[PDB]
Each structure stands twice: as structure tokens, then as C-alpha cells.
Amino acid sequence: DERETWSGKVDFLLSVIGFAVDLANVWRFPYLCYKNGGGAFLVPYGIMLAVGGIPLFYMELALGQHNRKGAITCWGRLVPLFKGIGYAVVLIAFYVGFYYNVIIAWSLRFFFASFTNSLPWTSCNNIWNTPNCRPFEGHVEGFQSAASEYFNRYILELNRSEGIHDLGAIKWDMALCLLIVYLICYFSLWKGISTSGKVVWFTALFPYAVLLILLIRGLTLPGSFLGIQYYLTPNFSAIYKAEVWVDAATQVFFSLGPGFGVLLAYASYNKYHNNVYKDALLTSFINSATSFIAGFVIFSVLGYMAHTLGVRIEDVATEGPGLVFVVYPAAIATMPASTFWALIFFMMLATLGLDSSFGGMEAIITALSDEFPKIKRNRELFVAGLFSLYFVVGLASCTQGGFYFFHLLDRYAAGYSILVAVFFEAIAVSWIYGTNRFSEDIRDMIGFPPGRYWQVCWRFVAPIFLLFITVYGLIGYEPLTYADYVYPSWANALGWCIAGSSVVMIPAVAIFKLLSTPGSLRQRFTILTTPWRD
Amino acid sequence: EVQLVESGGGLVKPGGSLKLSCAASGFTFSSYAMSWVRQSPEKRLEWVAEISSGGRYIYYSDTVTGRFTISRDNARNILHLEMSSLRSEDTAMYYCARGEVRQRGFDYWGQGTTLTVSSAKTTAPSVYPLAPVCGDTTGSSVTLGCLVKGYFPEPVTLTWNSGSLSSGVHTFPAVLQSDLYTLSSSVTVTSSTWPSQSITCNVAHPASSTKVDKKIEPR
Amino acid sequence: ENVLTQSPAIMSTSPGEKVTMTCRASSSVGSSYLHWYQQKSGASPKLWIYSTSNLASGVPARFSGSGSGTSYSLTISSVEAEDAATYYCQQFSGYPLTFGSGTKLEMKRADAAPTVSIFPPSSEQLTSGGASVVCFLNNFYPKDINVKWKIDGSERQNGVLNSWTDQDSKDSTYSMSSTLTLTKDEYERHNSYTCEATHKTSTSPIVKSFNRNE
Ligand SMILES: CC(C)CCC[C@@H](C)[C@H]1CC[C@H]2[C@@H]3CC=C4C[C@@H](OC(=O)CCC(=O)O)CC[C@]4(C)[C@H]3CC[C@]12C
Ligand SMILES: CCCCCCCCCCO[C@@H]1O[C@H](CO)[C@@H](O[C@H]2O[C@H](CO)[C@@H](O)[C@H](O)[C@H]2O)[C@H](O)[C@H]1O
Ligand SMILES: CC(C)CCC[C@@H](C)[C@H]1CC[C@H]2[C@@H]3CC=C4C[C@@H](O)CC[C@]4(C)[C@H]3CC[C@]12C
Ligand SMILES: CNCC[C@H](Oc1cccc2ccccc12)c1cccs1
Ligand SMILES: [Cl-]
Ligand code: NA
Ligand code: NA
């Protein structure tokens, strides 16, 4: 037959970089270095990257290029008994689309909010403020910074929600920003990679320009070198601790995207004899290199705050959305030409998420187009049907309690659910399908087989690597809370529906296909353990 | 270490079938893609077929596709090439080569097995001793000869005094004329050594069950 | 298919000199898919250079590889007689895989005249009804030689078989057999047989004859 292919090699490389490089490279990696002995954290981060992360990254990329199909068909064409893996992964990515784009909407709201010479989040004398407002971050819960109250009491209006039961009014300024996000995602994804592979040129490259600028602005700041000290001063007392190796393992596995069917779908439009092994190493490196660079951008500024603004580094060295929507903007408002750093900062955050949202959506579309040609012949219709569902339900995230809705999905939509999914991917490839066939498949593509190193990592390391994460992920479990709020019992179990909603397709479709193929049980396993190419 | 031994193969008639085999030993045969390369009697290398590690990826040259079938026995570590509708242009020595990495070529080759495709029929040679003329027995050295004429197919085995005499020997390669090979060998020794000592020409043509020894008397 | 042509086809070199051989492809080849093989007379090929410039195991450092696109070359810094062989290039970037046309490297030496011997039919062949006269032209250089047959005084041109030896690995010389076959009747109807060799050495040819009686 004939399947569409990238109009250029860079279009693919940028689509994969744009997917892999997002906010977690900015608001989590530097925190982990800071939290876990500085430069010493690079040791377990690098080991977990070379034995768990990149082996899984390389697998899906190779596996997607070789089978020329999306996530559902590929795993059906590989281990038919485990076609449910594809099903599981497709709607994990479907769930994530309900909260991830909320971050891009916030980034655009702060962008539109920065069109002035007096950035609003710098003062404590506005209508949205409390008597307990501080000019900069402290370490007492009831006394919040001027930037934290702007984000919480004006942008979010989160003070008006008693919990997830009380979502309250829809913020149509937010609802509008969210629509602009899905509009961009539409006119970039409706015509396929012909146009998608070109938008990533901007969304994946623009952040590097901003990083470059902010890197120079940060290092030229007084106190910049003090932040770099807090960032990278090594302390190997941590390497002996297990919770560090978990942070490294978990960040590695999540900063890269393996198993989400995104890389699968992306590599599926590669040429069969493309050197995907060269592509995996290059793209992996750039993802980690970007986090390492972004660390300087953040901590040069974080030191300037602790040096010239009189704050304790522990109070501003934070992670998650608080770092990009509260902490870093506060420092900008002190700098001259403040208005300039804001606009590029929030555009960087937007472009950092957009190209990741692209891959998640494309993983869904591609997977479904390769299984239901009715929607393959009607792409522009399917995406509008998809994105409108995303927008309508997305209005809940634009309510006054939308964060409680956001935090709920961020915990359950893809946390354990993807770990178990990739666990079977690794088992299906290395054990059911076979490293022999897999290596033989790769040789035919790139001309040489994988080294014994990669084969050992796919067969033993990656499973325990994922197991290592899933075990300790369950040990440190505690019910869902945000600030002084404790989610009700029913909301907790709701996230378990969402988690198991995907994973259940793995044993379900196994059962449904075991009961649909005729023969004896070993006669049925053998019919469901032989690939389509055979 | 690594060793490859090609087997089978000899003379077939146009249209016939034949099956060649390569015995691998000294490495994990099932981990390496193997290929059949051949060399025409005009000494030209031509790749024929490649089979992947597990035999799931097969490539044929456009000159043999539909007629040749390459296969693999990873249990006994044997490589196979099944030939059908054989043509005379398929006459060559067939090599079994190991080449798993394309960026590395064929790092190990067998010794070859020979395939002759002809409608010509097997014939035993006629061995003639080339005793010199009855002229002056001048010179320190004297040159004798052996004429192996009118046989088919290749090869023969020519030795002097059962192989004990090797220096001064020029065995000329065979030339095909009208579906028959002709071969000659020249040996040169000292005039003191002959006919003082015996010089015999040992010819062997296993295709015709022929094994002849000719002594060189100076009649 | 990607045709690979090699020049020169045959090449003679004195030990110690520098040889260069070329391989030109009809379609561009990735520098990492172009290999070289050395094949000695009557033996199997051996991988010599892989990925344009990387020497195989057991290959001395006097060999180097170079090139890109459609033009590659194998170079020997200072040749040794154990390098006399035919060298084949190969591409592995496209099916069908293709081999170059070969470059035969031969050893140069000082010119040498042939020692010519002539042999009449044996009575064993005469019983069969055939008669073939043989001429050996041994240990001469260079390779090109020319033979001429004469029955009585007249020159005979047809009914002849010529064979050439490979270059001797000892003295770098060549040798050739020439066999003229007649019928026994046509053989017994004349009584002077002559085999004269024209070689680069002598201006006049080297002649060897016999008469059918003595
Ligand atoms: C830029 C910094 C801040 C981030 C951490 C650096 C990584 C990009 C480096 C450090 C350890 C490296 C790895 C070290 C071990 C190897 C094994 C290597 O595979 C082989 O050993 C040969 C096998 C073959 O060639 O087939 C491939 C690259 C890799 C994974 C390296 C990949 C990249 C890694 C993760
Ligand atoms: C091309 C348009 C594309 C769609 C843009 C979507 C933007 C979302 C709607 C924003 O709503 C306005 O936002 C302004 C900023 O957040 C507010 O200005 C307030 O804040 C400004 C600073 O941000 C001050 O300069 C103003 O005086 C003050 O009214 C203003 O009240 C509010 O109604
Ligand atoms: C200090 C920091 C901000 C420097 C910025 C890094 C920039 C210059 C680097 C990081 C990522 C790199 C890109 C990564 C991938 C490729 C694919 C390659 O086929 C073309 C070049 C291209 C597109 C690179 C161009 C330069 C690049 C954008
Ligand atoms: C940093 N590498 C990509 C992140 C990845 O991004 C995605 C992975 C899968 C689907 C996604 C859909 C929309 C946006 C992002 C998606 C996520 C893993 C867990 C939550 S988000
Ligand atoms: Cl990271
Ligand atoms: Na991104
Ligand atoms: Na990332």
C-alpha cells in the first residue's frame, strides 16, 4: 500500500522534541536537582535515563516506524491477545487532553494580562488582596505573596470554591483562552503532518530563543551565581537514599513519553529504512539537555530573589505550576524592561505545551484512523468532534473550582494507568513477541541489530524499572489533598474509575478475543500469540 | 573459529532442480543473516539471495526470483538454496557468506560448491604421456608432460609421482572446446634424474570413476 | 540495480610502489555501506575493508580506503607480493546487492625469455585415431606471448588450444601450453612440425621443431 510520510526529516525530529520538551523540563527537573544533592542527582538521573528511559523511548520509536500503524492496530498486529494495550493507551491520552491544555490556557491568560507597563501581580493593594498579602514568598500558609494572590484570587478565583462539589461560575475570560488553545490545536492538526510537521518548527524552536534570552538576563543578574550554587552544588549523601532514585526514575520516564502511543504514531510516518536508532539518541539527549539548561534560567533568577529581594531560597525553589505562574513572574516585575520578559516567558510556556498537546492528540487520531477508515476519510470532521468534546467538558476547568478538577485528573488520568500499560508493552515486545523478532525487524530497517545492551534492558531492566516506580508509587500513597482541602471519598474513587477505565481494556480484550477465536486453549493462545506479518 | 562449508551441487540438465547446503559452525548461526553469492567461470561476483536471522526477511536478485528459494534451519545450523528451472547462466561456484550488519559486509565466506548446468554428458579423459623427442639430450634440465584430453565436467586432479614431485611443475588450467575439456601439465627435472628415476602422471576424474597413472617411457 | 565499475581491470606493480584502484557507482552509495574484498587465485574472497575506510581483522596498515558518493578508491601504500590478488568492491545500501567488476593486481618483474619445449603424439593416442602436438612455453615475462604452428613449411592456424597459468607466486613469471590436434591421417601425411614463439624479449622468434621419422 501507501501511507503518508513526513515532508521532511526535521518535521519528525521537531515533532518528537516538541512532544518530549514541555513544562516538566522547566518546573520539575531543576527542583529535583536542588532537592536531591545538586549535581550529584545527575548520577541516578543519568543511570535511570540509560537503563530504563531511553531503552523504552527507542523501543516505541522503532516499533512505530516498523509496523506503520497507530497504537491500536500496532499492538493488534504484534500480540493480538494484547490489542487492548493500544486501546488502553489511546484513551489515557484521551483523558490527559482534559487537563493538560488548561496549563496553556493559563499561559495565554497571563500573556494577555502582561500588556501594560505595570504588571498587576506585583502589588498587595488591589481588590483581590487580603490583609495577609506579602510582597514576596514566605513560609507561613495564611500569609501569601502578591503573586500568589493574583493567581489564586483573580485569575483562578479559587477562593470561591469550597471543593470539587462547588465549582461555581464559569470564567469566560478563561473559557476564551481555552478555546484559543483548541483553535490552534485544530488548524495545526486537521490536515495531518503535512501542516502539523510545520507548526512544530515554531512551537519547538521558539522556547530555545526565549531560554537563550532569559539565560543571559538571569546570569547577568546580581546573585545569579548564588542560585547556580543552590542548583548544582553536589552532595552525594542523597545517592544512598532510595527516594532519590525514585525521583530520577519517575522524572526520566515522564519527561520522555514512552508507551503513550505518541512516538509510535509519530514514527509510523517515517520511512522504513530511516535510522531511527540515531533519531532516538539525538531526541533523548535534547530533552535532558533542555532541562539542564532551563535549570540555569530558573535558579539564576531564584538566587537574584534570595540575594536582592530578601527571601529564603527554600520558599521560592518550588515546583509545578506555582514556579511559573507565581514565583518567576514576581522576580520579573522587579527587573527593568519587566513587561518584555513576561510576554516572552508566557509565550515560552504556551509553546512548551502546545507541541506536547499535538503529539497526544495525534496519538489518538492516528490510532483511530488506522482502525476505522470511516474517520480516516473524514479527519477534519473527527478532530472538530474531538476538540469540541474537549472544549465543552473543558468548561468545567474554567470554573472557579477548576483547579480542584485539574488536580484530580493530574493525579489519576495517566499516573498508575500508564505505568501498567507500558509494563505489558515491554513484556509483549521482549517476551511474547520476542527480542529475536524485534532485533530482526530492526536490522531490516537500519541495517544492523540492536546491541546486547539494549536487548538486556528491554528484557529485564525496563520491567523492574517500571515495577520499581509502581511499587514505591504505591508505598507513598496518601489520599488526594490540595492545601487544606481534602477531597471527599467519592471523588477519590472517581479517579480510580478513570485509572482502571484504561487498564481494564488489557485483560478485557484478552478475554473478549479468547472467547472469539475457535479452538483448544493452547490452540487459542497460539492463534493469539502469532503476529500479523506471520 | 567461524567456519562455513558449502555442499551438494555438481552437474544438472537445463530445467533440472538442485539443492545446495551450507554447514555453519563456530558461532550462533541463528543470530546472523546469511546470503548466497556466486562467481561465474568468467570470475564475476553476483549476489543471489539474502535470508534474515529468523528467515522472516528474504531478498532475491531479479535474475533468480521465482526459481531460487533460500531457507534456514536454525536447529541444525544449515543454510539451503533450492534451485529450479536451471539455466546455463546459473553455472557458477556458489558461496555461502555471513553478513548480518549491512554496514560491515560479508565477514566470513565458505569455500564454495560448484554447479555446472549443461546438456553435455559426462565423459572420462584420455591421459597421454608427453615423452620428449629423440634429439640431442642437451641441457641440465629436461621437461616432461602429461596430456589430459576430452573429458567433462570439471574438475580433475593431476599430480606427479603421487604428489612427491612438486617443484618444476606447471599444471595449465582446462579449456572447454565443443563440450569437452583438455588439460596439460609440464614438469621439468635434471637430465641426471630421468629416465634414471621414474616420472608418472597421476590423473583423477571422480565424475567418471576414472583414476589413471601413466609412466613416461622415452620410446 | 546499482552498477559498480572498477578501474583499472589489470594492474602490474613493483614491490614497494604505491597502487591505487577506483570503484565508480552508477548511483550514490552511503559511505558506510561500501566494502572491499580481496580474493586470491583459487581461494575464497575475504572481507578486506568495510564502511569505506575501516580495515578488517588481519589486514595490514598499508591498506587504506577513501571516497564518497559515487567515487571510492582502495590504496596500498607500499605493495608486497602477498598482495597480488583481485580486489572487489561492494555496496550494501540497496537491494539487489552488487559487486564491482574487479581489479587484478599483479606483480611486476624483470623481463624473462620462455623455455620452449615441443612434444609429438604418443602411440597411445595414435591408436585412437587422433594426433595432437603440444608446445610448452614456460617461465617468461610479461604475460603476452604469441604462438605460430607450422606443418612442414606451411603455417596452420586452426585446431589449436592455448592455456595460460596464473602468475607464479615464486618468481612472478607466466607459462603457457599450446596444443594442435589433427587427424592421424593428416598427421602421418606430413613429417615436419614446428612451434615458434614470438615474445617481447627476442626480435626473432624462438623455434622448436621435429621430424616425424627420427
Ligand atoms: C546532558 C546531561 C545533563 C543529561 C545526562 C547525559 C545523557 C544524555 C547521557 C549520560 C549517560 C549516557 C548514556 C550512557 C550509556 C549509553 C549506552 C550506549 O549504547 C552502547 O553502549 C553501545 C550499543 C550499540 O552501539 O549498539 C548508547 C548511549 C548511552 C545510553 C548514553 C546516552 C546518553 C546518556 C544517557
Ligand atoms: C485579541 C483578544 C484575544 C482574546 C483575549 C482574551 C483575554 C481574556 C479576557 C481578559 O479580560 C480582561 O483582562 C484584562 C487583563 O487581565 C483586565 O484588565 C485589567 O488588568 C489590566 C492589566 O493586566 C489593567 O491594565 C486594566 O486596567 C484592568 O482592567 C480586564 O479587566 C478584563 O476584563
Ligand atoms: C542556550 C540554549 C538556549 C541554546 C539553544 C539550543 C538550540 C540552538 C539547539 C537546541 C535544539 C537544536 C535543534 C535540535 C534538532 C535539530 C534537527 C537537525 O536536523 C537540524 C537542527 C536542529 C533543529 C537543532 C537546531 C539547534 C537547536 C534548536
Ligand atoms: C513531557 N513529555 C510529554 C508529557 C506527556 O504529554 C502527554 C502524553 C500523552 C497524552 C497527552 C495529551 C495531551 C498533552 C500531553 C500528553 C504527559 C505524560 C503524563 C501527563 S502528560
Ligand atoms: Cl527531565
Ligand atoms: Na512540548
Ligand atoms: Na519532558
Residue found by looking up cell 594426433 in the block? C131
Tell me whether residues C138 and B130 touch, CB distance under 8 A: no
A141 touches chain B (CB under 8 A): no
φ and ψ at residue A472, rounded to 5 degrees = -65, -30
What SS3 class is residue A499?
helix
Q: Which CATH superfamily is domain B3-117 in?
A: Immunoglobulins (2.60.40.10)
Calpha distance A338→A331 (Å, rounded): 9
Q: What's the sign of the alpha-carbon dihedral A457, A461, A463, A467?
A: negative
A80 lines ligand 4 (CB under 6 A): no
Contact A443, B100 (CB under 8 A): yes
Cell (9 digits) for B100:
548480518
Measured from the Cβ of residue A487, the count of other Cβ atoms closer than 10 Å reads 20
SS3 B147: strand
Distance between CA atoms of residues B179 and B155, nearest Å: 14
Pocket lining: A288 vs ligand 1, CB cutoff 6 Å: yes
Which residue's alpha carbon is nearest to atom 19 within ligand 2?
A113
Q: In C151-172, which positions are buried (b, 16+ CB within 10 angstroms) versus exposed (e)?
A: beeeebeeebbebbbebbeeeb
Instruction: Residue B38: list chain C partners with CB under 8 A.
Output: none
CA atoms within 13 A on the CB side of C130: 15
Q: What is the distance between the alpha carbons of residues A478 and B166, in angstroms, rounded to a whole number?
A: 91
First to last CA, chain A: 18
Q: Which helix (H) or strand (E) holds A496?
A: helix A489-503
* CA of A515 vs chain B CAs: smallest distance (Å): 30
Neighbours of C77 (CB within 10 A): 13
Eight-state DSSP code of residue B123: B
Q: Tell me whether residue C144 is exposed, middle or buried, using C-beta atoms within 10 angstroms of its C-beta: 0 to 12, 13 to 18, 19 or more.
A: exposed
Give the experimental resolution in Å: 3.0
Grid coordinates of A534: 506471520
Secondary structure of chain C in the HEC alphabet?
CCCEEEECCEEEECCCCCEEEEEEECCCCCHHHEEEEEECCCCCEEEEEECCCEECCCCCCCEEEEEECCEEEEEECCCCHHHCEEEEEEECCCCCCEECCCEEEEECCCCECCEEEEECCCHHHHHHCEEEEEEEEEEEECCCCEEEEEECCEEECCCEEEEECCCCCCCCCEEEEEEEEEEHHHHHCCCEEEEEEECCCCCCCEEEEEECCC
Angle at which helix A276-304 crosses helix A242-255, to 10 degrees, equals 120
C-alpha B171/C-alpha B169 separation (Å) is: 6
Phi, psi of B139 (to 5 degrees): 90, 150
Domains in chain C, start-ordered, CATH in brackets?
4-107 (2.60.40.10), 115-211 (2.60.40.10)
The cell for B137 is 639430450
R_g of chain B computed on alpha carbons: 22
Spatial contact of C11 and C75, defined as CB atoms under 8 Å apart: no
Nearest Cα neighbor of A309 from A119, A129, A146, A149 is A146
Cα B202 from Cα B188, distance rounded (Å): 16
Residue A396 CA to residue A410 CA, distance in Å, equals 15
Residue A267 grid coordinates: 514514527
- Whether B39 and B136 have beta carbons less than 8 Å apart is answered as no
Instruction: Show Cβ contacts of residue B35 under 8 Å, excluding neighbours closer than 6 positions.
Output: B47, B48, B49, B50, B51, B96, B97, B99, B106, C97
In chain A, how many H helices and how many E strands? 29, 2
Tell me which chains share at least 3 CB pairs under 8 Å with chain B.
A, C
Beta-sheet pairing, C10-13 with C103-107? parallel
Distances (CA, A) of B78 to B32, B58, B59, B73: 12, 16, 18, 5
Half-sphere exposure for A57 (CA within 13 Å, toward CB): 28
Which H or E run contains B39?
Answer: strand B34-39
Residue nearest atom 18 in ligand 3 by C-alpha distance: A10
C-alpha cell at C90: 561492494
Taking residue A1's Cβ as centre, other Cβ atoms within 10 Å add up to 3
Q: Which atom of ligand 3 is nearest to the CA of A215?
A: 1
Experimental method: X-ray
Q: Rounded to an integer, what distance in angstroms lies between the CA atom of residue B210 and that of residue A52?
A: 68
When CB atoms are compared, the residue of B103, B170, B171 closest to C32 is: B103
Q: Tell if the CB–CB gap between C51 and B47 is shorter than 8 Å.
A: no
Provide the residue ranges of all domains of chain A, joining segments of one domain with +: 1-534
Residue A20, number of CB atoms within 10 A of its CB: 26
C115/B103 Cβ within 8 A: no
In chain B, CATH 2.60.40.10 covers 3-117, 126-215
| Residue with CA closest to ligand 2 atom 10 | A173
Judge whether B88 and C30 are in contact, CB under 8 Å: no
End-to-end CA distance of chain B: 54
Please name the CATH architecture into which domain B126-215 falls.
Answer: Sandwich (2.60)
Residue type, C42: G
Q: Assess C136–A contact: CB distance below 8 Å, yes or no.
A: no
Q: Are A447 and B101 in contact (CB under 8 A)?
A: yes
User: Does any ligand 4 atom lie closer than 6 A to the CB of residue A356?
Assistant: yes
Beta bridge partners of B183: B148
